[PDB]
RNA sequence: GGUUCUCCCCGAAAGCUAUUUAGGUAGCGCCUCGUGAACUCAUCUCCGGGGGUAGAGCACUGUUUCGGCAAGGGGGUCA
């Protein structure tokens, strides 16, 4: 009857919700720690970045060639 | 610098490694949630082990104080 339908168990999870007081558990800085790079609004680092060590793909060696027979 | 409602459960780290890196970041180490298997792990008993620290010692590496024998050396004496 329109008002008495439910969605099933475990359906709708809330959602986290950042910077709503103390009860919440995440709340002043919403689970992102205190200061650095990764705390801050854009923060974090490109894919594949080891912290200027040169990363698992620039120290391993290129191979191969693709074929258009193989396509 | 600041990041706003509430109860319940578990709960770190300030280490290693690398870095124009050192107040940053990444992988591992430590937290957590979830998913499966073996007596898997922990505590203590009685066995098997390797070590070269504490201590001790002076054959070796050097160092060090005495006493006994003593080549070899330092002072003297000749035609
Ligand atoms: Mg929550
Ligand atoms: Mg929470
Ligand atoms: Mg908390
Ligand atoms: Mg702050
Ligand atoms: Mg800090
Ligand atoms: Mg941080
Ligand atoms: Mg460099
Ligand atoms: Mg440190
Ligand atoms: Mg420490
Ligand atoms: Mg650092
Ligand atoms: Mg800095
Ligand atoms: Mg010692
Ligand atoms: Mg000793
Ligand atoms: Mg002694």
Same mark, same amino acid.
């Given at each position: ?5 439910? $969605? ?40 594949? &970045?080891?912290?200027?060590?040169? $990363?698992?793909?620039?120290?391993? $060696?290129?191979?191969? &060639? ?6």
């Amino acid at each position: 009857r329109l008002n008495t339908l439910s $969605p099933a168990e475990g359906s709708k999870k809330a959602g986290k919700r950042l910077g709503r007081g103390i009860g919440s558990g995440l709340g002043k800085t919403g689970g992102r720690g205190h200061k650095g790079q990764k705390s801050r609004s854009g923060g974090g680092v490109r894919r594949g &970045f080891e912290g200027g060590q040169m $990363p698992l793909y620039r120290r391993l $060696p290129k191979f191969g &060639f693709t074929s258009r027979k193989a396509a």
